[PDB]
Amino acid sequence: GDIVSEKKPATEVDPTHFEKRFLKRIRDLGEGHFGKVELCRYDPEGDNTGEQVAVKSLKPHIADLKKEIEILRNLYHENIVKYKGICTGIKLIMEFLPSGSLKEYLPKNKNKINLKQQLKYAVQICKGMDYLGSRQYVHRDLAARNVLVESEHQVKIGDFGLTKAIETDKEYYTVKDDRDSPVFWYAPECLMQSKFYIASDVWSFGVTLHELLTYCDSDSSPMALFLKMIGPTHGQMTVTRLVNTLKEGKRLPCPPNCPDEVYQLMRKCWEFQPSNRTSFQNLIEGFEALLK
Ligand SMILES: C[C@@H](O)c1nc2cnc3[nH]ccc3c2n1[C@H]1CC[C@H](CCC#N)CC1
């Protein structure tokens, strides 16, 4: 008799599924060598009223992006950027923070952001990082460019492209791809043996705190300052030159107008040996003591 077809199941909406046809690119926000993030509007009504979102996609590594999505999808913390969903190849949809990262926000808001507010941001970054460490992750890319500004009073860790799980009962993750490491943010064990501990993120945090205290000025950046300390024309010998400097005991200097008590907390992040470094919880205590 009549053509047979399939009875249609009632289709619910998944609020975490973003349809490609409604996701409209506004502009680039940032990138790496394999990934990039764009500002889009998700505009199903087509009248430019939809919400703005940050969209992370691959540059023309799918497995790594899917792993990043699964990591972020399951992080819930006020100082970690919010997962919104996916668009499926696959794109990661996150909340968009108009102020951008500390690199964008700090140079423009020096007058508004005093030492007290910097310390509160420092606490917030530590709380986010301590949460990540409690989920048994190492971030491996903690720098001011990856700290987003939600408001004058709040920051969030805003990218997880290099984040890796540390195996249960084990203490570090060993890295293989290292061609694009942010070496001027990396602890010695990372630079020398390619091992990543939670203590390695504490080291990076120290450097990120330096950036925050210098309002992310490009002439005071950890790279600029290190290249001054070791020489800017060593090419492929740069990292060995860096490693030796750190071995000698040389560190980034105290930022202008940074009180010594703040600088001492920073130096505890940079004990040459991972086991000798401060923890994120102890940093929080330290900053809070300075705020009260
Ligand atoms: C301006 C730029 O720093 C920026 N503004 C953002 C606003 N909302 C966002 N939500 C998620 C990221 C994000 C944002 N990012 C950058 C943060 C760092 C990443 C780095 C990883 C890549 N690609 C690029 C986008």
What are the backbone angles phi and psi of residue 159, rounded to the nearest 5°?
-155, 150
Alpha helix positions (H), the chain: 62-73, 102-108, 115-134, 188-193, 198-213, 222-230, 238-248, 260-268, 280-291
Contact 173, 166 (CB under 8 A): yes
Contact 227, 245 (CB under 8 A): no
Method: X-ray
Among 270, 265, 276, 273, smallest CA distance to 123 is for 265
* Topology given in CATH for the domain delimited by 11-96: Phosphorylase Kinase; domain 1 (3.30.200)
Among 163, 158, 126, 123, smallest CA distance to 141 is for 163
Sign of the dihedral defined by the CA atoms of residues 118, 130, 82, 25, in that order? positive
Closest C-alpha residue for ligand 1 atom 24: 30
Return all residues near 243 (Cβ < 8 A) that are at least 6 apart. Answer: 188, 191, 192
Q: Which atom, in ligand 1's list, is nearest to the CA of 36?
A: 23
User: Rounded to whole angstroms, how far apart are CA atoms 132 and 71?
Assistant: 10
What number of CA atoms fall less than 13 Å from residue 144's CA on the CB side?
Answer: 27
Mind telling me the catalytic residues?
141
Q: Which atom, in ligand 1's list, is nearest to the CA of 54?
A: 10
Q: What is the three-class DSSP state of 77?
A: coil
Task: Give domain limits for the chain.
Answer: 11-96, 97-292
Lining ligand 1 with CB less than 6 A are 29-32, 35-37, 54, 81, 94, 96-97, 100-101, 104, 145-146, 148, 158-159, 161
* Topology given in CATH for the domain delimited by 97-292: Transferase(Phosphotransferase); domain 1 (1.10.510)
Closest C-alpha residue for ligand 1 atom 18: 146
Q: Which long-range contacts (CB under 8 A, 24 or more apart) does 65-69 make?
A: 65/35, 65/90, 65/92, 66/90, 68/92, 68/160, 68/161, 68/163
Query: The tokens 């500002």 sit on which residue?
Result: 39
* Same CATH fold assignment for domains 11-96 and 97-292: no
Ligand 1 center–CA 200 separation, angstroms: 23
Among 154, 92, 151, smallest CA distance to 123 is for 154
Ligand 1 center–CA 30 separation, angstroms: 6
